[PDB]
Amino acid sequence: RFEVKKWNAVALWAWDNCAICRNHIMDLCIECQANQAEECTVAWGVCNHAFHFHCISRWLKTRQVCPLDNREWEFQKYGH
Amino acid sequence: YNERCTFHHQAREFAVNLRNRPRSFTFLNDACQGLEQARKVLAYACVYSFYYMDVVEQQTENLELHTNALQILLEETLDCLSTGMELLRRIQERLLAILQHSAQDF
Amino acid sequence: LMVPLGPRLQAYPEELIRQRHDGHPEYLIRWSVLKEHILMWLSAPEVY
Amino acid sequence: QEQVSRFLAAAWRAPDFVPRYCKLYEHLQRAGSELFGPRAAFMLALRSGFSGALLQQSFLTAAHMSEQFARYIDQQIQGGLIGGAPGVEMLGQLQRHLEPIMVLSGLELATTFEHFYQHYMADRLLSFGSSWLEGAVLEQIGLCFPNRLPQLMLQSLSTSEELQRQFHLFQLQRLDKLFLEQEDEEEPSPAISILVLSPRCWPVSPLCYLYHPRKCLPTEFCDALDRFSSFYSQSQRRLQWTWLGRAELQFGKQILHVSTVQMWLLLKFNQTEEVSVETLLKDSDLSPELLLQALVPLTSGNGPLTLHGVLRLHEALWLIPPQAYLNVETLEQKRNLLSCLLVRILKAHGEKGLHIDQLVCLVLEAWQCTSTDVLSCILHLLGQGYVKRRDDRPQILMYA
Amino acid sequence: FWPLFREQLCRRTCLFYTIRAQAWSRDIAEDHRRLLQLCPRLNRVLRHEQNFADRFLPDDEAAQALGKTCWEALVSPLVQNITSPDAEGVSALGWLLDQYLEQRETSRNPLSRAASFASRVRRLCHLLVHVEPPSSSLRNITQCWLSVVQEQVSRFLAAAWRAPDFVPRYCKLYEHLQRAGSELFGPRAAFMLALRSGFSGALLQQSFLTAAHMSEQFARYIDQQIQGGLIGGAPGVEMLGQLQRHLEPIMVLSGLELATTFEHFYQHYMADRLLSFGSSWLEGAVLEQIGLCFPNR
Ligand SMILES: [Zn+2]
Ligand SMILES: [Zn+2]
Ligand SMILES: [Zn+2]
């Protein structure tokens, strides 16, 4: 006979505009959409989310984590 | 046995430290003399062991703990006289009894 | 015993002033405030 | 550059490619030092020459080279962990040779290098443990990876450990509540460790899944899984169990280390004296190739089973299947499509240009891939001379 | 007419509950086995006061004021009383926690006296800390935990500083006490600091020959683990993980009178390792973890 003395089970966990300001992903920035005349370029980060440079500038000046995945935000500088 | 050896070593170290560096003073001196005698007895006991049993072991551990506490207090200090004299007499008697038991054993 | 009652208020008992839900009388102890006077019924274990 | 390109085009198929490449790097560095003395401009020149020669290559060959680099690192790590006296020498040679491979930093090969490093790191972390070796190698060459996936894997393991601690506390609290309820109204086992993975960072296959766990594993293990699932839900994301993992078995005086498929087959074996392969397949409902790869190291020498194909009893072993390396005989098609769409969007958007991040947004929507994939395609098209950056606005992409 | 009522009711509540606190305290001082029953009484008082507040006081600020008064009147002197050492040196909460840790091993059978004892202690401590954020209650409870840990570790050290299992049993004790502290007081930082301080104190209260022997033991354990992990196969890859776990119980030497001897003995073994095998990854990793424990680098 056989007696299991240890086991290690594995399990995957499984389950898109500018969520932080909720405007359309390709649209403009609401903070500056109130002050009409649209200068925020989109920003990308290692954690693979796309947000507005305005949104992110402010938010980061407040806090220092990615608001969507709880990791230290890192401005993506690959391919640049 | 390890606990008794550690207690004896600590008591010897404290006694050496006290030797290296007014009723309270007389009481401390008497306690130090009694602790030195008890430490000599404990060293002899450990040497004999290295070369009512449970009750005797418990009594030895209690005496070692009392001697260590008295030495620690005397180091921290730097009726009562009758109690100290009785403790010293009991310690000397225990030392003599342990020596007699050792001589009878070997 | 000067029971603290705040940052700058303490209390101390003065004297029994009467006797009267457990079959055992209470005591209407008076308490002097040292910075009025409070009246408090206290049970026998509590006052002891 | 001429020397290294000659070498690359000369021998990229031979199996000694990575050792020869590293020896070439060391020899050229020593020669440059002997000629021009120790300076920094010349080291920069050497690195740039290697980079240029790598880039001036074909795509299938670049993919082959990336796979070879990853395979070499994996072999060295595995050997240095397992072996004895030679393993130390191997680990030394590796911590030396890791400098030539950092020439892949920032190039257009880093994505394929990382996508191939992921597989081998997964097999390693699941067979052995999250050894300090992986952490050291990543602190050394951790910037070659654009997306930083291996670091996320290593973080997943620690997250799982924290989950274990919290699960213990949660169970204690449930017990305390029940004891209080029962008091106020009145007034020799297998250790299981669970590992949760995040499909953003682990490349688990959609073929290594367990759908109906109760129909395969014993009741005790199924109950343990159910309890942990309840905790995950009550504290949360579902949970899909997989056939991956390892286990320790006791068989007589022998202590065996097996994979989950191996453990399950053997456990089923412990209530009879012979098993039929067709019955095993029908009952398991998994890949027959997987079943064969799991069975192979069992019927072989020093194995607890015997073949006759019926399986019977044969009458600290380590019977874990070795890592079957990939062979680059779809990445090219993906690059082609991404390049085509990117060129189309760049030509349509007017010579006024567009922003690169907004460009990635457009390309991802059009596909609707990865930001790193689109970025590397962009680098490829910039190198090949089909697009350029606006001198006035570097973020503006101007077609040529 | 609000501030008159505020002052009068605050005073009345504060005095009544201070009197009752001293009553319960003098009750618990007589028989030490009364805390297990002290939990439900507190539950009743808190429930009644919350009912009253919710029914007859509109402003959330008013409610919070009454609650803070009731708490700081009843639970603060009760704590400062049940966690105050006697002449021998055993407080009531100290005794309770010591008994918890001692009977923890036999508390697995979910139908036994130890199970009930453990449940009661757990609930009582969680209640006593359920209002923390340095208050005058968390401080006393922290010192009590420190004392319990120090006594346990001192007993262990004076017991077995000779056997060749010293370092493994030391680390197992560390893990046991840490998990116990977490399951008692919830995951907090002050209590981990208390654990480290207790271990450090137990170490310091020792003699010189014993300190030297302990240091040599730690160094030999590190060396044996490193050598095995490098040389052996699957057993070695198993040992290196245990080694990685066990460095935190050794980092407690960072900044004591033993670090000098620990370092003087680590030198001797690192020399032979470095002249038998090369400056591998293992030495660099071990140092990047426990580096600051060496005064002279
Ligand atoms: Zn936005
Ligand atoms: Zn904006
Ligand atoms: Zn993110």
Numbering used by the authors:
A (entry chain C): 21 to 35, 40 to 61, 66 to 108
B (entry chain B): 2296 to 2316, 2326 to 2355, 2361 to 2387, 2403 to 2430
C (entry chain B): 10 to 29, 32 to 46, 61 to 73
D (entry chain A): 1481 to 1667, 1691 to 1739, 1750 to 1821, 1830 to 1836, 1845 to 1858, 1864 to 1902, 1921 to 1952
E (entry chain B): 1302 to 1434, 1465 to 1628
The publication says:
However, the vertebrate-specific CUL9 complex with RBX1 (also called ROC1), of interest due to its tumor suppressive interaction with TP53, uniquely encompasses both cullin–RING and RBR domains. However, the vertebrate-specific CUL9 is unique in encompassing two distinct types of E3 ligase within the same polypeptide. With 2,517 residues, CUL9 is the largest cullin and RBR protein, and among the dozen largest E3 ligase subunits, and its structural mechanisms have remained elusive.
Superimposing homologous regions of protomer A (unneddylated) on protomer B (neddylated) and vice versa show that the hexamer could be formed by either a fully unneddylated or neddylated complex, the former also observed in a map obtained through symmetry expansion. One of the most abundant cross-links (K188 with K188 in the ARM1 dimerization interface) was absent in XL–MS for the ‘monomer’ mutant. It is noteworthy that unneddylated CUL9K1881R–RBX1 remained hexameric. Examination of the structure showed that the arrangement of CUL9’s WHB domain and RBX1 RING would require reorientation to achieve the conformation for neddylation. Structural modeling of UBE2F on RBX1’s RING in the unneddylated protomer A suggests that neddylation requires yet another CUL9–RBX1 conformation.
